[PDB]
Design a protein around this ligand. Structure first.
Ligand code: NAG
Ligand code: NAG
Ligand code: NAG
Ligand code: NAG
Ligand code: NAG
Ligand code: NAG
Ligand code: NAG
Ligand code: NAG
Ligand code: NAG
Ligand code: NAG
Ligand code: NAG
Ligand code: NAG
Ligand code: NAG
Ligand code: NAG
Lengths: 98, 421, 203, 178
């Protein structure tokens, strides 16, 4: 290295501790109740249910892998448990396999 | 422009009677802000996944940083090619007698905390640094080497060696010389004999003083006077703003925030989204760097002219036309402005014209006579040889004229009597 | 010889960088075209090769743009060397600090790898001595100004001397010219101006 | 930090020019919080030629000397024991000086460094424009040189650069038909 002043890199201070804040609601979201319905509505008239003011244990739902295909096109299933949502709407109906 | 005509006639000349001393300002840029960007922080924003993905693209980052560092060093080179032409630091004498001339407006003012001159104060107020725009996103601004108080010291050493030394302090050891004697040689430089000054010293001094005074009013009245420097600032600040806004564009990704993409999706699907942002931001950085390279080339081309006007007009009288002032150059003074330099070119301009009849020879006794230095002119009854640029008749004698040939050969020769001293 | 040397490095380094750009994935599975071709069929090899093509095309564009800017910079110095040769070498230059620091006398060119070296010869005054000066000289009711030079006195006599090499000369009429009457110029001082013609008439 | 944003009842997050969040409202307690990035800055190593020595100084760009020890690039590098302040930043490993010399390694903002012997150390000082001088101006005083000198000064200039040609197809594809 020849005489001079060289910009080797940039320094960033490191975090000390992690702090997490979440709205806490005693109610647990009735996700199971949506799938517990004895009879689903007709396909031409699908049923819509809104879920709010509760805590959703997506981890339990995912681990309770009773579903064949469970894919989310805008989110990853693993990240769902940590992530939080504002408005949740479940649309239930019946279709064909194809 | 206004319609005009010249009453051309093959035996008609016009020799001006009075003159004028006019001080005209000229503004030049000399450097630009020394911005410096950190590729990795800008593109990835301190995320490990993005930082790893950015490694595949190669050495774009290092060759962006090399270009920006080259520009930054060029700026310090420009700021020093202009002002740092003086070997030493001179000091103006405590006594201020200069034969009538008044430099109070240009020389440093001791009262102020900084040794700026009043005109320098006006210039620094008009072009407010960071007037427009100028940033946690890896963009930083580095300080110039010369602290803006050393620039004042340089422009005062130049201006205090010009007053007492003249053109000599730039070509050897500075040699003292009284100012009213220096102007008598600046006058010979333009083809006007020296006696024109000492005989009209008082009027010339007052014209110079008033001309200097009007500069402050002219600068104060119009805010756009220093626009030429101000534009530079904007052109830089504007650019930076654009670059920053480029961080809010999707470029096709689901979102423009890296954290949201990372938290929504696992790496297997997040790689595709992040790659588009990396490509877009890399393209934006390349655009910014190329534009800065071209703009810096332009500024360098202007610094190379500022450093030439400093050498040929501040440190000596210039014979080039319309190079240093509109008229016949007499001298020049520097002033420092934010990211630039302002010259005050002093020039001589003839004012009042009177016309006569002129003949290119004088057949005294069969031998033509041509004037050594001057022009033959007659008011109708007598013939006088007059210097070109200031009407001053003088009886014609052998000392002003030299003989070459016979009378029949020439065209337009006219009879007359040439006195014999 | 830094300047010339610098040029070479700026070029060489660039080339090196360009060559190294051939070892980068740019997102492809490999940076070697042969490996991609020999491991994958064209239907899947097209996707991989497109990224390498885009990356290398971008690298070539970067190189060419940098070379264009650098060539403009070098042309700006070729156009100044071609002016120094025209005005310094082929004639004497009156421009200040153009053909060397001092009063220019001549210059000599020399070739160097990718450049030219001038040897500017210049004149510089060395030893200084100071005197008392007066702008005019009132012989008898007539101001006298020096035709070419400046008045200076060593304390007892007045001499008109050129302004770049001390050389006193007795003041006479031939090197001074008259303009006006005394008492109109500040600093005019009494003195006697010799008459070259008078002694001959007396003789 | 606590801030004075004055959020509206239906408003949750603030925003920046670059679309980066810079204000929130704690979900549990409605107080308004302002978010700031943690301190960062470039690090510049001032070094004499490795041939001369292997001792160097470190400049933290526009950072508080009180905060430099908190920084993580490594080594503490004698923080506190040798610290100098300047408008460019905090300089560590350099010894201040009152004398003024020419500039060797320009740190910036008028501060220049050098590697002097006194057995050697890096000294950071204020650069000097040049030797002070004065001219005995006087309205009836001139100075006329009595002797001269002839000086030959060199001047180097570039005039051209290497002529290189790159074959696009050979470079990009390397003689492959696909
Ligand atoms: C959260 O917990 C706190 C505990 O102090 C409680 O006061 C508050 O009502 C809870 N609600 C939300 C929405 O966070
Ligand atoms: C000569 O002309 C100038 C410039 O127009 C004027 O100011 C001056 O009064 C005129 N008369 C003189 C110098 O005697
Ligand atoms: C002109 O000179 C006088 C006397 O030195 C000084 O008081 C004055 O400030 C100078 N300039 C102006 C613009 O008044
Ligand atoms: C002299 O100038 C006047 C205007 O000042 C003009 O009217 C006149 O024609 C001119 N005379 C000659 C002979 O050119
Ligand atoms: C011309 O100037 C001379 C100067 O001696 C004067 O005698 C003469 O009257 C002038 N002629 C005219 C026509 O003005
Ligand atoms: C000037 O033009 C006139 C027009 O009548 C002509 O007679 C004369 O010869 C010309 N003189 C010169 C010196 O050209
Ligand atoms: C001058 O006078 C002579 C006669 O003395 C005459 O022939 C001649 O034409 C006059 N002028 C010129 C310019 O020839
Ligand atoms: C002449 O120059 C000397 C230095 O060479 C200086 O000390 C002295 O004051 C000067 N004398 C005059 C009369 O200016
Ligand atoms: C000035 O120079 C003249 C030249 O004749 C000489 O006679 C005289 O002594 C000198 N005076 C001094 C004070 O050196
Ligand atoms: C020079 O300045 C002195 C200072 O005492 C003064 O007396 C004298 O009149 C001035 N002379 C000239 C020619 O300016
Ligand atoms: C010259 O001498 C005369 C006669 O004593 C005197 O009136 C005058 O003031 C002196 N000075 C000048 C510059 O003429
Ligand atoms: C550091 O912050 C302090 C105030 O806490 C300030 O006075 C000082 O100028 C800042 N910069 C330093 C110490 O480099
Ligand atoms: C430098 O000068 C300052 C006062 O200006 C003083 O406090 C300090 O001790 C001096 N340092 C040296 C090394 O002389
Ligand atoms: C002028 O300078 C030369 C070179 O140093 C020296 O030899 C000579 O004696 C000096 N004086 C002269 C030439 O009068």
């Amino acid at each position: 290295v020849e005489k001079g002043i060289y910009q080797t890199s940039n320094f960033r201070v490191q975090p000390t501790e992690s702090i997490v804040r979440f709205p806490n609601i005693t109610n647990l979201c009735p996700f199971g109740e949506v799938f517990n319905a004895t009879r689903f509505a007709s396909v031409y008239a699908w049923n819509r249910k809104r879920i709010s003011n509760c805590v959703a244990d997506y981890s339990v739902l995912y681990n309770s892998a009773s579903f064949s295909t469970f894919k989310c096109y805008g989110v990853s299933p693993t990240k769902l448990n940590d992530l939080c949502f504002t408005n949740v709407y479940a649309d239930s109906f019946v279709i064909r396999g194809d | 422009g206004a319609e005009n005509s010249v009453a051309y006639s093959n035996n008609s000349i016009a020799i001006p009677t009075n003159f004028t001393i006019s001080v005209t300002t000229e503004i030049l840029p000399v450097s630009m802000t020394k911005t410096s960007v950190d590729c990795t922080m800008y593109i990835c924003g301190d995320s490990t996944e993005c930082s790893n993905l950015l490694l595949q693209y190669g050495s774009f980052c290092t060759q962006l940083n090399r270009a920006l560092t080259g520009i930054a060093v060029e700026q310090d080179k420009n700021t020093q090619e202009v002002f740092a032409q003086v070997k030493q630091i001179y000091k103006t004498p405590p006594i201020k007698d200069f034969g009538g001339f008044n430099f109070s407006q240009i020389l440093p003012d001791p009262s102020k905390p900084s040794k700026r001159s009043p005109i320098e104060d006006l210039l620094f107020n008009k072009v407010t640094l960071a007037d427009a725009g100028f940033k946690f996103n890896g963009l930083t601004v580095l300080p110039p080497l010369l602290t803006d108080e050393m620039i004042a010291q340089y422009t005062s050493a130049l201006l205090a060696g010009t007053i007492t030394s003249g053109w000599t302090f730039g070509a050897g050891p500075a040699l003292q010389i009284p100012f009213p004697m220096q102007m008598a040689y600046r006058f010979n430089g333009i083809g006007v004999t020296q006696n024109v000054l000492y005989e009209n010293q008082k009027l010339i001094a007052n014209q110079f003083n008033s001309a200097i005074g009007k500069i402050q009013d002219s600068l104060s009245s119009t805010p756009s006077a220093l626009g030429k420097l101000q534009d530079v600032v904007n052109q830089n600040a504007q650019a930076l703003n654009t670059l920053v806004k480029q961080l809010s564009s999707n470029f096709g990704a689901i979102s423009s925030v890296l954290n949201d993409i990372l938290s929504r999706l696992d790496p297997p699907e997040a790689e595709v989204q992040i790659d588009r942002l990396i490509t877009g931001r890399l393209q934006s950085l390349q655009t910014y760097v190329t534009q800065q390279l071209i703009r810096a080339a332009e500024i360098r081309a202007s610094a190379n002219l500022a450093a030439t006007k400093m050498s040929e007009c501040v440190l000596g009288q210039s014979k080039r036309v319309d190079f240093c002032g509109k008229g016949y150059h007499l001298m020049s003074f520097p002033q420092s402005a934010p990211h630039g330099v302002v010259f005050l070119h002093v020039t001589y301009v003839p004012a009042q014209e009177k016309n006569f009849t002129t003949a290119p020879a004088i057949c005294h006794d069969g031998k033509a006579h041509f004037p050594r230095e001057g022009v033959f002119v007659s008011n109708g009854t007598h013939w006088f040889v007059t210097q070109r640029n200031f009407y001053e008749p003088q009886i014609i004698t052998t000392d002003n004229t030299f003989v070459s040939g016979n009378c029949d050969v020439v065209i337009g020769i006219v009879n007359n009597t040439v006195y014999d001293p | 010889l830094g300047k010339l040397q610098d040029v070479v490095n700026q070029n060489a380094q660039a080339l090196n960088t360009l060559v190294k750009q051939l070892s980068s994935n740019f997102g492809a599975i490999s940076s070697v075209l042969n490996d991609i071709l020999s491991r994958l069929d064209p239907p899947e090899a097209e996707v991989q090769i497109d990224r390498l093509i885009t990356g290398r095309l971008q690298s070539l564009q970067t190189y060419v743009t940098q070379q264009l800017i650098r060539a403009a910079e070098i042309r700006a110095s070729a156009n100044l060397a071609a002016t120094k040769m025209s005005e310094c070498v082929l004639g004497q230059s009156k421009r200040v600090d153009f053909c060397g620091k001092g009063y220019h006398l001549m210059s000599f060119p020399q070739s160097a790898p990718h450049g030219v070296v001038f040897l500017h010869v210049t004149y510089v005054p060395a030893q200084e001595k100071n005197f008392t000066t007066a702008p005019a000289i009132c012989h008898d009711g007539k101001a006298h100004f020096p035709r070419e030079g400046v008045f200076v006195s060593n304390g007892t006599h007045w001499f008109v001397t050129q302004r770049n090499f001390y050389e006193p000369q007795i003041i006479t009429t031939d090197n001074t010219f008259v303009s006006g009457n005394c008492d109109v110029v500040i600093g005019i001082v009494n003195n006697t101006v010799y008459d070259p013609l008078q002694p001959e008439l007396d003789s | 930090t606590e801030s004075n944003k004055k959020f509206l009842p239906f408003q949750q997050f603030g925003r920046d020019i670059a679309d980066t969040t810079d204000a929130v409202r704690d979900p549990q307690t409605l107080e308004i919080l302002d978010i700031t990035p943690c301190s960062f800055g470039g690090v510049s190593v001032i070094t004499p030629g490795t041939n001369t020595s292997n001792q160097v100084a470190v400049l933290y760009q526009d950072v508080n000397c009180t905060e430099v020890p908190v920084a993580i690039h490594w080594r503490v590098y004698s923080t506190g024991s040798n610290v100098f302040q300047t408008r460019a930043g905090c300089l560590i490993g350099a010894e201040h000086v009152n004398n003024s010399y020419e500039c060797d390694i320009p740190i910036g903002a008028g501060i220049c460094a050098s590697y002097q012997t006194q057995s050697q150390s890096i000294i950071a000082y204020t650069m000097s424009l040049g030797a002070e001088n004065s001219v005995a101006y006087s309205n009836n005083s001139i100075a006329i040189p009595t002797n001269f000198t002839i000086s030959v000064t060199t001047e180097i200039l570039p005039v051209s650069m290497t002529k290189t040609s790159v074959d696009c197809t050979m470079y990009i594809c390397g003689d492959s038909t696909e």
